[PDB]
Amino acid sequence: PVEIYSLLALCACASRAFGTCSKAFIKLKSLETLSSEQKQQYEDLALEIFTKHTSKDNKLPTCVATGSPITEYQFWMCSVCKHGVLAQEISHYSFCPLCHSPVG
Amino acid sequence: LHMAMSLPGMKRIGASTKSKDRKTEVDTSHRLSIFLELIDVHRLNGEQHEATKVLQDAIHEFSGTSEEVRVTIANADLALAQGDIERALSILQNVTAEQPYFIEAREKMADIYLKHRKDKMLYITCFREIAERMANPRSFLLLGDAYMNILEPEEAIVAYEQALNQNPKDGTLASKMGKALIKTHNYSMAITYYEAALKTGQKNYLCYDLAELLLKLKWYDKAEKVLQHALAHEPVNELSALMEDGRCQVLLAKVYSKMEKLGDAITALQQARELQARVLKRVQMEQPDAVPAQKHLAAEICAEIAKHSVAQRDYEKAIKFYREALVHCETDNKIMLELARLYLAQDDPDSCLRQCALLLQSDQDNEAATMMMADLMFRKQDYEQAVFHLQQLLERKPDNYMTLSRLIDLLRRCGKLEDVPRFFSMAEKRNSRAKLEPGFQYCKGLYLWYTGEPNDALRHFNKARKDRDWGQNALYNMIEICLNPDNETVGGEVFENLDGDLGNSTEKQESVQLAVRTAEKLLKELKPQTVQGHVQLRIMENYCLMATKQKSNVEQALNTFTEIAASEKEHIPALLGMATAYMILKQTPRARNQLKRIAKMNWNAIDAEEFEKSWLLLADIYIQSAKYDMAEDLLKRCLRHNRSCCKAYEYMGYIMEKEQAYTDAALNYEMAWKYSNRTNPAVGYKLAFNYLKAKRYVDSIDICHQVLEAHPTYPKIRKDILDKARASLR
Amino acid sequence: PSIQIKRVMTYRDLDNDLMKYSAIQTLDGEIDLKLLTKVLAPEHEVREDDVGWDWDHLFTEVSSEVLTEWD
Ligand SMILES: [Zn+2]
């Protein structure tokens, strides 16, 4: 969880998603596998971030190529990994991005 | 448990056991605990059928009782044992609000939804039903905790507010409000809520919370005002009021320390000390629980008083207050370390050694205690045993790196760097990724720099510049390397006059400009935290200005160094900087007088490199003024305090040349040539010449070959040395 | 190669990385996120080229790298 939510918080900070950034530090601090010094570091960094800026912010199958949900009903599907890729990004890959099996 | 079965009343509670002994009757909860423990033990024993039979016995017996729901929970647990999710869900769904332990059953419902099916909406609706069926603050707080677990802070805050509205004051619940508001990082509304609370009929606990919050995000004045308003209460003898006043006084002292009022902080800490003394007197009989906590708080108060006295340079009262704090709590390693550090500061080796021995008895590794004891006994010049202590600590804990760094420094001052790499061996043995550890990288860079390969040492340092702890020291070392890579005497002119034409290469000036630019870029990376850090940053910025070789910049650095020296008395780095500024600007007599003053003070374990630079520059001045005797004395001093100072050995070789001590000059030049990693062809030239004069032709030829391999174009060596040595072989 | 050339190359190499990764290393240029960037990975480590992953060759590669890593 620590890597997941640190990456999520970093993405939120780099993408101006401070609501998700706060939702990320909440879980990051609440994680039980962290040292007290590490908790203090996370709390101090969150304090600096949220004094700088406001904390308040502004299932379907998932495309392997770009993580966006596959809205369209007709979509390219892999023959092995059983995970689809959008019709606008199928032609770019000569093998399935998830499993590197041949496209087709 | 089977013997417990035979206990009276442990068979069908309510079977008309007319013993007329309704004082030792088996409590229903106790009996259910016995049965559940037996079921769990049998399940661990593999008797699944027997455990199920006992569970059925419990269900049959306790039907219609308050504890019966718990049994069903255990039954649901059995389903979780069997993996039948739907069976457990139905069993817990049978639980209704009227029955006791309903909250536990529905919480288990929610946990099963969350862990297995991961239905966040169902996980929410479980606690929503809990809140709706029992409108109590407990249910609403549980719902808020659920939302915080699903990471929906806004609805969690709404639920918390509903909880604190169901009971308007509720005491502790109000404080929970603030913590919730402080956890979701909604700081502005948290401040408003604290102000609203404080405005009416609330006790100073919310005052403490608001003061802590204001301190956290840097509004010192408002925190001080709130603390003073809350502390204006009369000195009530109530114990709780005493503890509240003590903690508020401590926090106000921290506020004053933050906003730079030392005397007020000390007065507040003294008042807190008196309050804590009263608390310690009362609690030993009035509250058995708080005795260790109050003792530790008193120890912390005394430690803070002593630290601020140190900040005021009142060392005796600092020692007294550390002794008081240690009396309050003897197991505080940090206070012991601070006391040892002050004992070292007061130049009292005996007390520091005693504290180090006590701390090492308390804990064998205690890296910092090893640091202080090793430094103390290095002051005794017992190099071998201090190296032994550091080596034993490193061989016991190869992961340690700061100990490794201090070992590298001690070995460099001992001139025994050859043993450095082997440690790396087991440093690499413990972890295959140990080469990626910032501490190991920093130590490797330090070793490479001390052996005389600045570029690769700088590259190794680079990988440690991003460390949380090693970053600052790594940046310092990169700045030092870039500003002056050749490790020559800044402002010295004993050899600069000998380098009249060699320094005319424009590539040297371009490299100097590039290094200065890189150092200025690195300066922005540094983030000083204390006043000492800012002083160090200013000192090295002044050094960077000096390296720019701009007369206006040099004079500005001179003025800044003079101001810093006036600000901090007897500051060795400032004295060295201002003396170098006088030297470069040709204010030579002023530099001579300043270095005469500097040499009077004694060497210390913190400013060793500044001391060495000062002594080297003074030796430069003396040699320029033909004062060979005292220059020789100072150079011997510098070599005594460090056994691998290449410049000192080169100066000694030059001195022995001036007296035609060809053997001694050859030895010194050889040592300098070895420790410089043969990157200075001029030193090799001098060394080969000294061998040639001493009639040692083969060694002269060897050194000439080494120099020419290092630099095939280095002139005046083929004929003036090599050819003459070759002609004199027979 | 000239020693000054080596020094210049080292200085340029050191200067490169800071401005290379300042884009995501810091927020707005004043807040340093070194605490959160520690979980990221090197650029080249997250580059994958579109090549078929047959079981045998992939297994041999991962086995070899595991054996090299394992000790
Ligand atoms: Zn696929």
Side-chain angles (χ1 to χ4, degrees), chain A residues 1-14 16-31 33-36 38-39 41-42 45-47 49-51 53-55 57-58 60-70 74-87 89 91-104, chain B residues 1-165 168 171-175 177-202 205-360 362-363 366 368-389 391 393-395 398-589 591 593-596 598-730, chain C residues 1-3 6-7 10-12 14 19 21-68:
Chain A
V2 54
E3 283 219 23
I4 290 189
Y5 291 126
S6 44
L7 168 59
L8 175 63
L10 191 154
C11 287
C13 293
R16 295 301 196 276
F18 293 111
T20 315
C21 168
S22 166
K23 290 163 79 172
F25 292 102
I26 290 178
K27 192 54 172 290
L28 263 190
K29 284 182 305 176
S30 76
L31 199 43
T33 74
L34 268 295
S35 165
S36 179
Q38 303 165 328
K39 280 177 171 294
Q41 301 156 227
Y42 276 107
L45 196 146
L47 177 137
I49 284 297
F50 297 136
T51 44
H53 305 88
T54 81
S55 299
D57 202 78
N58 185 26
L60 293 201
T62 302
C63 175
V64 172
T66 53
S68 310
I70 317 180
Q74 298 81 357
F75 57 105
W76 179 96
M77 177 40 90
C78 182
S79 46
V80 170
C81 83
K82 299 305 178 184
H83 296 80
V85 171
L86 291 163
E89 298 156 352
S91 310
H92 284 42
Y93 298 95
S94 299
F95 305 98
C96 183
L98 185 47
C99 60
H100 284 112
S101 76
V103 291
Chain B
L1 292 144
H2 285 37
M3 294 299 291
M5 295 299 102
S6 64
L7 290 188
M10 187 66 204
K11 279 300 173 301
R12 177 63 269 183
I13 280 185
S16 75
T17 61
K18 305 179 181 182
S19 58
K20 296 181 181 181
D21 291 325
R22 302 182 180 185
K23 289 183 178 181
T24 177
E25 175 180 356
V26 186
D27 193 3
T28 315
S29 180
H30 282 143
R31 165 147 198 192
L32 183 48
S33 304
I34 297 190
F35 270 133
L36 292 204
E37 183 71 14
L38 168 68
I39 289 165
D40 200 4
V41 164
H42 268 180
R43 186 193 61 83
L44 297 184
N45 202 28
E47 307 173 5
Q48 315 171 0
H49 313 265
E50 190 77 23
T52 302
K53 194 172 188 178
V54 176
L55 177 64
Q56 286 160 9
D57 294 3
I59 292 180
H60 181 74
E61 165 172 18
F62 292 95
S63 57
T65 67
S66 62
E67 313 288 333
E68 181 196 12
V69 161
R70 292 176 42 197
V71 193
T72 67
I73 297 180
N75 193 17
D77 277 327
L78 179 60
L80 294 182
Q82 303 183 7
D84 197 350
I85 296 298
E86 306 149 346
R87 197 197 87 174
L89 295 184
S90 50
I91 287 173
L92 292 177
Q93 270 173 10
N94 312 144
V95 181
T96 56
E98 297 85 359
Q99 317 293 333
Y101 306 86
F102 168 76
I103 54 171
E104 300 177 358
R106 202 65 66 182
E107 271 181 325
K108 182 177 180 176
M109 185 64 73
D111 207 320
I112 291 182
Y113 285 166
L114 162 71
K115 171 178 52 175
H116 293 279
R117 312 207 179 187
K118 315 169 186 181
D119 197 320
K120 288 189 171 185
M121 283 73 74
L122 271 184
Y123 189 26
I124 287 178
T125 52
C126 284
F127 283 94
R128 268 172 182 161
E129 279 189 354
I130 294 172
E132 285 187 20
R133 265 189 300 277
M134 311 155 38
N136 54 61
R138 192 176 179 179
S139 60
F140 281 95
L141 188 153
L142 282 175
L143 171 64
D145 279 359
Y147 283 165
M148 289 265 285
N149 281 338
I150 318 160
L151 308 180
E152 295 177 1
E154 293 179 353
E155 300 183 8
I157 291 164
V158 167
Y160 271 130
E161 281 189 350
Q162 293 169 6
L164 188 63
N165 281 10
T172 300
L173 202 48
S175 68
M177 201 36 48
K179 282 188 178 183
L181 266 189
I182 210 63
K183 206 167 179 185
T184 66
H185 314 96
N186 289 350
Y187 290 91
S188 57
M189 64 184 73
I191 300 175
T192 61
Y193 164 69
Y194 291 167
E195 287 171 352
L198 292 188
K199 276 193 170 178
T200 298
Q202 297 279 341
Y205 58 104
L206 290 148
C207 278
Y208 190 98
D209 289 328
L210 189 40
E212 174 57 38
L213 160 57
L214 290 158
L215 175 137
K216 276 185 173 179
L217 55 86
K218 304 300 185 184
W219 289 104
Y220 306 110
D221 309 332
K222 309 189 177 183
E224 166 186 0
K225 294 164 186 179
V226 172
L227 281 149
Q228 285 161 350
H229 166 39
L231 266 178
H233 292 102
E234 298 185 2
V236 192
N237 286 336
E238 184 180 3
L239 198 53
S240 63
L242 287 181
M243 271 86 78
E244 189 275 332
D245 296 330
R247 59 204 284 278
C248 282
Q249 279 277 352
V250 173
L251 198 148
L252 178 55
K254 275 187 182 175
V255 167
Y256 282 164
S257 180
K258 277 301 176 183
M259 61 79 71
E260 295 91 25
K261 279 184 180 174
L262 287 172
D264 304 333
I266 292 185
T267 54
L269 277 178
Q270 201 65 26
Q271 297 177 0
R273 182 200 179 189
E274 306 165 358
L275 295 172
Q276 211 60 34
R278 309 180 193 172
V279 167
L280 287 172
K281 288 173 184 176
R282 264 200 169 95
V283 173
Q284 299 161 2
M285 294 182 286
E286 291 182 3
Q287 272 186 19
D289 284 336
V291 170
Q294 297 309 323
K295 282 185 180 181
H296 197 275
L297 174 56
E300 288 179 345
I301 286 177
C302 299
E304 276 296 336
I305 298 184
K307 289 171 182 182
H308 284 103
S309 66
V310 169
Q312 294 180 346
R313 308 183 188 181
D314 198 323
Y315 296 83
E316 46 276 13
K317 68 171 288 216
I319 294 176
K320 166 185 181 179
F321 277 128
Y322 279 166
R323 291 198 167 183
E324 294 180 11
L326 284 188
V327 163
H328 284 345
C329 276
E330 294 285 339
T331 66
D332 212 323
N333 299 326
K334 296 168 297 303
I335 303 183
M336 263 289 268
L337 181 141
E338 273 289 335
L339 181 61
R341 273 180 180 167
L342 288 177
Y343 279 155
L344 189 136
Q346 274 194 176
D347 310 336
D348 183 14
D350 306 332
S351 307
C352 197
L353 283 154
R354 283 173 283 181
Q355 306 296 331
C356 289
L358 291 175
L359 189 52
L360 280 162
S362 176
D363 164 39
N366 200 306
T370 300
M371 301 295 188
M372 283 74 75
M373 61 79 71
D375 300 2
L376 288 163
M377 65 180 288
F378 189 88
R379 298 274 288 277
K380 298 176 172 180
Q381 300 173 357
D382 196 339
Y383 319 94
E384 50 89 16
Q385 259 293 330
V387 170
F388 159 76
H389 292 105
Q391 185 174 1
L393 176 52
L394 286 180
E395 79 205 4
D399 51 352
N400 201 324
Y401 301 134
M402 159 65 58
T403 303
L404 182 58
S405 64
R406 288 247 180 162
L407 179 83
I408 305 312
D409 275 330
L410 290 192
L411 283 170
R412 185 195 76 157
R413 299 190 200 281
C414 287
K416 296 188 179 179
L417 296 179
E418 311 91 349
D419 291 331
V420 167
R422 72 159 165 176
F423 295 106
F424 292 165
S425 75
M426 61 285 278
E428 291 142 346
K429 286 313 178 63
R430 177 163 179 162
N431 175 22
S432 64
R433 302 184 182 181
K435 55 190 60 179
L436 304 182
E437 298 282 340
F440 173 79
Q441 289 276 353
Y442 180 75
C443 292
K444 216 164 182 181
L446 265 193
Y447 161 66
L448 298 189
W449 176 23
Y450 295 152
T451 43
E453 52 274 21
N455 296 334
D456 305 337
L458 188 153
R459 287 165 181 170
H460 273 85
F461 278 139
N462 168 44
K463 305 173 185 178
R465 84 169 189 175
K466 290 186 295 181
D467 182 73
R468 186 198 179 194
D469 303 334
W470 299 111
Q472 208 170 2
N473 304 321
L475 291 178
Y476 295 168
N477 285 140
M478 311 265 268
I479 290 167
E480 269 283 349
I481 288 178
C482 291
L483 281 184
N484 182 30
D486 289 331
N487 203 27
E488 54 95 22
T489 302
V490 193
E493 293 189 14
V494 171
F495 295 125
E496 181 61 47
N497 309 333
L498 296 179
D499 293 331
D501 189 68
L502 317 175
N504 290 333
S505 56
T506 177
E507 309 177 5
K508 227 162 185 177
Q509 314 165 2
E510 303 140 21
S511 173
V512 163
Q513 285 219 11
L514 296 165
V516 164
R517 293 175 178 175
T518 317
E520 285 144 339
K521 293 161 192 176
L522 281 172
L523 287 168
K524 323 158 187 173
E525 197 87 5
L526 274 166
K527 285 190 174 184
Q529 279 287 339
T530 62
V531 184
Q532 299 83 341
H534 300 80
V535 169
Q536 199 78 19
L537 178 52
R538 293 167 54 183
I539 291 303
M540 291 216 268
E541 286 184 6
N542 291 285
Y543 284 165
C544 289
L545 293 181
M546 301 215 87
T548 52
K549 301 187 177 181
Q550 280 186 351
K551 187 177 186 184
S552 58
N553 292 352
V554 176
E555 296 170 354
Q556 167 191 351
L558 171 61
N559 313 139
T560 301
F561 275 133
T562 307
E563 298 144 16
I564 294 173
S567 70
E568 291 169 335
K569 299 289 94 176
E570 298 187 349
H571 196 257
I572 306 164
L575 286 174
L576 174 55
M578 61 79 71
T580 46
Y582 283 138
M583 172 56 257
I584 294 182
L585 295 167
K586 209 65 179 178
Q587 297 217 358
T588 306
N593 304 316
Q594 263 297 322
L595 274 299
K596 281 183 179 183
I598 294 159
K600 297 172 184 177
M601 283 73 74
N602 308 343
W603 177 97
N604 52 55
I606 53 168
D607 310 338
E609 277 73 6
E610 286 86 5
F611 268 116
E612 292 180 32
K613 283 191 171 179
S614 63
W615 285 328
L616 280 191
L617 180 54
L618 192 38
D620 164 82
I621 302 164
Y622 286 155
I623 297 289
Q624 289 177 198
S625 56
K627 307 170 191 170
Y628 301 86
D629 299 332
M630 64 184 73
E632 170 179 343
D633 291 331
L634 283 175
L635 290 163
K636 285 160 173 169
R637 193 167 168 178
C638 179
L639 277 184
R640 182 185 310 133
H641 278 267
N642 169 26
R643 220 172 326 279
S644 71
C645 178
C646 182
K647 260 306 174 189
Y649 276 111
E650 184 173 333
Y651 285 130
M652 191 75 38
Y654 178 46
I655 296 183
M656 302 318 206
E657 175 274 342
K658 275 280 201 172
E659 307 178 5
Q660 293 185 0
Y662 288 133
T663 46
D664 296 313
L667 186 54
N668 300 280
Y669 275 127
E670 172 184 359
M671 182 85 48
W673 174 253
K674 167 194 171 183
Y675 292 167
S676 78
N677 209 43
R678 56 180 40 85
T679 64
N680 199 346
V683 189
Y685 188 101
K686 310 290 184 185
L687 168 63
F689 174 82
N690 283 277
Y691 291 167
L692 169 75
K693 283 309 172 177
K695 310 301 186 299
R696 310 173 54 193
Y697 304 128
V698 165
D699 302 327
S700 178
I701 291 163
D702 283 330
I703 288 301
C704 274
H705 284 318
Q706 286 177 25
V707 171
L708 272 187
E709 174 194 350
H711 305 80
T713 70
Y714 195 84
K716 289 320 182 178
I717 196 181
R718 179 86 37 80
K719 163 182 177 177
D720 306 340
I721 312 292
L722 180 55
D723 275 347
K724 305 192 175 182
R726 274 174 169 170
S728 299
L729 276 173
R730 286 175 172 175
Chain C
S2 169
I3 307 102
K6 310 174 190 177
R7 286 175 181 168
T10 311
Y11 306 156
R12 307 289 75 64
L14 271 296
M19 283 73 74
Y21 280 154
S22 62
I24 62 170
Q25 190 45 242
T26 51
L27 176 54
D28 290 3
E30 69 275 16
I31 306 169
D32 186 74
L33 298 188
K34 63 189 283 183
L35 174 74
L36 296 187
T37 53
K38 73 163 59 53
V39 306
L40 278 182
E43 179 68 27
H44 50 80
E45 200 268 325
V46 300
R47 314 300 300 101
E48 55 276 63
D49 303 358
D50 204 5
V51 288
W53 280 7
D54 186 74
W55 202 98
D56 311 288
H57 85 88
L58 187 39
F59 177 77
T60 53
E61 190 276 331
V62 301
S63 67
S64 57
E65 60 88 13
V66 159
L67 294 174
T68 54

PDB file of all heavy atoms in Angstrom, chain B residues 352-370, unseen atoms left out:
ATOM      1  N   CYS B 352      32.867  12.939  30.324  1.00  0.00           N
ATOM      2  CA  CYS B 352      32.345  12.418  29.065  1.00  0.00           C
ATOM      3  C   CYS B 352      32.642  10.932  28.924  1.00  0.00           C
ATOM      4  O   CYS B 352      31.791  10.164  28.462  1.00  0.00           O
ATOM      5  CB  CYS B 352      32.931  13.201  27.892  1.00  0.00           C
ATOM      6  SG  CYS B 352      32.021  13.010  26.344  1.00  0.00           S
ATOM      7  N   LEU B 353      33.843  10.509  29.320  1.00  0.00           N
ATOM      8  CA  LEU B 353      34.180   9.090  29.283  1.00  0.00           C
ATOM      9  C   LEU B 353      33.293   8.291  30.227  1.00  0.00           C
ATOM     10  O   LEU B 353      32.865   7.181  29.893  1.00  0.00           O
ATOM     11  CB  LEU B 353      35.653   8.888  29.637  1.00  0.00           C
ATOM     12  CG  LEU B 353      36.671   9.209  28.542  1.00  0.00           C
ATOM     13  CD1 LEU B 353      38.008   9.594  29.155  1.00  0.00           C
ATOM     14  CD2 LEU B 353      36.831   8.028  27.596  1.00  0.00           C
ATOM     15  N   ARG B 354      33.016   8.832  31.415  1.00  0.00           N
ATOM     16  CA  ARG B 354      32.131   8.140  32.348  1.00  0.00           C
ATOM     17  C   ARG B 354      30.733   7.978  31.765  1.00  0.00           C
ATOM     18  O   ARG B 354      30.137   6.895  31.844  1.00  0.00           O
ATOM     19  CB  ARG B 354      32.069   8.898  33.674  1.00  0.00           C
ATOM     20  CG  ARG B 354      33.287   8.711  34.557  1.00  0.00           C
ATOM     21  CD  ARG B 354      33.220   9.617  35.774  1.00  0.00           C
ATOM     22  NE  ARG B 354      33.559  10.997  35.449  1.00  0.00           N
ATOM     23  CZ  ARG B 354      33.599  11.985  36.333  1.00  0.00           C
ATOM     24  NH1 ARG B 354      33.320  11.780  37.610  1.00  0.00           N
ATOM     25  NH2 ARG B 354      33.929  13.207  35.927  1.00  0.00           N
ATOM     26  N   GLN B 355      30.194   9.046  31.173  1.00  0.00           N
ATOM     27  CA  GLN B 355      28.866   8.962  30.570  1.00  0.00           C
ATOM     28  C   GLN B 355      28.852   7.975  29.411  1.00  0.00           C
ATOM     29  O   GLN B 355      27.899   7.204  29.253  1.00  0.00           O
ATOM     30  CB  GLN B 355      28.404  10.342  30.101  1.00  0.00           C
ATOM     31  CG  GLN B 355      28.445  11.421  31.169  1.00  0.00           C
ATOM     32  CD  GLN B 355      27.497  11.155  32.319  1.00  0.00           C
ATOM     33  OE1 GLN B 355      26.464  10.513  32.152  1.00  0.00           O
ATOM     34  NE2 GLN B 355      27.846  11.655  33.499  1.00  0.00           N
ATOM     35  N   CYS B 356      29.902   7.987  28.586  1.00  0.00           N
ATOM     36  CA  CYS B 356      29.980   7.052  27.471  1.00  0.00           C
ATOM     37  C   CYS B 356      30.044   5.614  27.963  1.00  0.00           C
ATOM     38  O   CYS B 356      29.406   4.727  27.387  1.00  0.00           O
ATOM     39  CB  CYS B 356      31.192   7.373  26.599  1.00  0.00           C
ATOM     40  SG  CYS B 356      31.038   8.895  25.645  1.00  0.00           S
ATOM     41  N   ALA B 357      30.818   5.362  29.019  1.00  0.00           N
ATOM     42  CA  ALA B 357      30.897   4.017  29.574  1.00  0.00           C
ATOM     43  C   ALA B 357      29.547   3.567  30.114  1.00  0.00           C
ATOM     44  O   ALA B 357      29.126   2.426  29.885  1.00  0.00           O
ATOM     45  CB  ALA B 357      31.961   3.961  30.670  1.00  0.00           C
ATOM     46  N   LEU B 358      28.847   4.455  30.826  1.00  0.00           N
ATOM     47  CA  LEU B 358      27.527   4.104  31.339  1.00  0.00           C
ATOM     48  C   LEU B 358      26.558   3.801  30.203  1.00  0.00           C
ATOM     49  O   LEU B 358      25.806   2.820  30.258  1.00  0.00           O
ATOM     50  CB  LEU B 358      26.989   5.232  32.217  1.00  0.00           C
ATOM     51  CG  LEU B 358      27.695   5.456  33.554  1.00  0.00           C
ATOM     52  CD1 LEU B 358      27.128   6.678  34.260  1.00  0.00           C
ATOM     53  CD2 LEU B 358      27.575   4.221  34.434  1.00  0.00           C
ATOM     54  N   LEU B 359      26.569   4.628  29.156  1.00  0.00           N
ATOM     55  CA  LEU B 359      25.660   4.427  28.035  1.00  0.00           C
ATOM     56  C   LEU B 359      25.981   3.147  27.273  1.00  0.00           C
ATOM     57  O   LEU B 359      25.068   2.433  26.843  1.00  0.00           O
ATOM     58  CB  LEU B 359      25.713   5.636  27.100  1.00  0.00           C
ATOM     59  CG  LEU B 359      24.659   5.679  25.997  1.00  0.00           C
ATOM     60  CD1 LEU B 359      23.270   5.486  26.582  1.00  0.00           C
ATOM     61  CD2 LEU B 359      24.740   6.991  25.233  1.00  0.00           C
ATOM     62  N   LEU B 360      27.268   2.839  27.101  1.00  0.00           N
ATOM     63  CA  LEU B 360      27.659   1.617  26.411  1.00  0.00           C
ATOM     64  C   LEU B 360      27.318   0.384  27.234  1.00  0.00           C
ATOM     65  O   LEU B 360      26.975  -0.664  26.676  1.00  0.00           O
ATOM     66  CB  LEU B 360      29.153   1.654  26.086  1.00  0.00           C
ATOM     67  CG  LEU B 360      29.532   2.470  24.848  1.00  0.00           C
ATOM     68  CD1 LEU B 360      31.014   2.817  24.860  1.00  0.00           C
ATOM     69  CD2 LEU B 360      29.162   1.721  23.578  1.00  0.00           C
ATOM     70  N   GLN B 361      27.416   0.485  28.562  1.00  0.00           N
ATOM     71  CA  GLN B 361      26.908  -0.581  29.415  1.00  0.00           C
ATOM     72  C   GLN B 361      25.403  -0.740  29.240  1.00  0.00           C
ATOM     73  O   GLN B 361      24.887  -1.864  29.216  1.00  0.00           O
ATOM     74  CB  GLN B 361      27.255  -0.297  30.876  1.00  0.00           C
ATOM     75  N   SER B 362      24.683   0.378  29.122  1.00  0.00           N
ATOM     76  CA  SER B 362      23.245   0.311  28.885  1.00  0.00           C
ATOM     77  C   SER B 362      22.930  -0.341  27.544  1.00  0.00           C
ATOM     78  O   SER B 362      22.008  -1.160  27.445  1.00  0.00           O
ATOM     79  CB  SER B 362      22.636   1.711  28.957  1.00  0.00           C
ATOM     80  OG  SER B 362      21.255   1.682  28.643  1.00  0.00           O
ATOM     81  N   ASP B 363      23.683   0.005  26.501  1.00  0.00           N
ATOM     82  CA  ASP B 363      23.459  -0.563  25.178  1.00  0.00           C
ATOM     83  C   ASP B 363      24.801  -0.697  24.476  1.00  0.00           C
ATOM     84  O   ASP B 363      25.555   0.277  24.389  1.00  0.00           O
ATOM     85  CB  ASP B 363      22.501   0.306  24.354  1.00  0.00           C
ATOM     86  CG  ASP B 363      22.540  -0.021  22.872  1.00  0.00           C
ATOM     87  OD1 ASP B 363      22.637  -1.217  22.523  1.00  0.00           O
ATOM     88  OD2 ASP B 363      22.464   0.918  22.054  1.00  0.00           O
ATOM     89  N   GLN B 364      25.087  -1.897  23.969  1.00  0.00           N
ATOM     90  CA  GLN B 364      26.417  -2.192  23.447  1.00  0.00           C
ATOM     91  C   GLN B 364      26.721  -1.474  22.139  1.00  0.00           C
ATOM     92  O   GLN B 364      27.857  -1.027  21.950  1.00  0.00           O
ATOM     93  CB  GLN B 364      26.581  -3.701  23.255  1.00  0.00           C
ATOM     94  N   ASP B 365      25.752  -1.349  21.231  1.00  0.00           N
ATOM     95  CA  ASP B 365      26.067  -0.765  19.934  1.00  0.00           C
ATOM     96  C   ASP B 365      26.087   0.756  20.007  1.00  0.00           C
ATOM     97  O   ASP B 365      27.155   1.363  19.881  1.00  0.00           O
ATOM     98  CB  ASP B 365      25.060  -1.232  18.880  1.00  0.00           C
ATOM     99  N   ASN B 366      24.919   1.359  20.240  1.00  0.00           N
ATOM    100  CA  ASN B 366      24.754   2.788  20.534  1.00  0.00           C
ATOM    101  C   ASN B 366      25.749   3.648  19.753  1.00  0.00           C
ATOM    102  O   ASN B 366      26.609   4.323  20.323  1.00  0.00           O
ATOM    103  CB  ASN B 366      24.855   3.052  22.036  1.00  0.00           C
ATOM    104  CG  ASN B 366      24.232   4.377  22.434  1.00  0.00           C
ATOM    105  OD1 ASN B 366      24.570   5.427  21.889  1.00  0.00           O
ATOM    106  ND2 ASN B 366      23.294   4.327  23.372  1.00  0.00           N
ATOM    107  N   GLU B 367      25.630   3.581  18.424  1.00  0.00           N
ATOM    108  CA  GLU B 367      26.588   4.157  17.482  1.00  0.00           C
ATOM    109  C   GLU B 367      27.138   5.506  17.929  1.00  0.00           C
ATOM    110  O   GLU B 367      28.352   5.731  17.891  1.00  0.00           O
ATOM    111  CB  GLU B 367      25.943   4.300  16.102  1.00  0.00           C
ATOM    112  N   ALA B 368      26.254   6.406  18.361  1.00  0.00           N
ATOM    113  CA  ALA B 368      26.701   7.727  18.788  1.00  0.00           C
ATOM    114  C   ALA B 368      27.585   7.659  20.028  1.00  0.00           C
ATOM    115  O   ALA B 368      28.567   8.405  20.127  1.00  0.00           O
ATOM    116  CB  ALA B 368      25.493   8.628  19.038  1.00  0.00           C
ATOM    117  N   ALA B 369      27.254   6.792  20.988  1.00  0.00           N
ATOM    118  CA  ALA B 369      28.114   6.640  22.157  1.00  0.00           C
ATOM    119  C   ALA B 369      29.500   6.168  21.745  1.00  0.00           C
ATOM    120  O   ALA B 369      30.514   6.632  22.285  1.00  0.00           O
ATOM    121  CB  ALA B 369      27.489   5.666  23.155  1.00  0.00           C
ATOM    122  N   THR B 370      29.556   5.242  20.785  1.00  0.00           N
ATOM    123  CA  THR B 370      30.833   4.850  20.206  1.00  0.00           C
ATOM    124  C   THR B 370      31.541   6.053  19.601  1.00  0.00           C
ATOM    125  O   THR B 370      32.760   6.199  19.741  1.00  0.00           O
ATOM    126  CB  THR B 370      30.620   3.762  19.155  1.00  0.00           C
ATOM    127  OG1 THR B 370      30.001   2.622  19.763  1.00  0.00           O
ATOM    128  CG2 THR B 370      31.946   3.339  18.545  1.00  0.00           C
TER     129      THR B 370
END
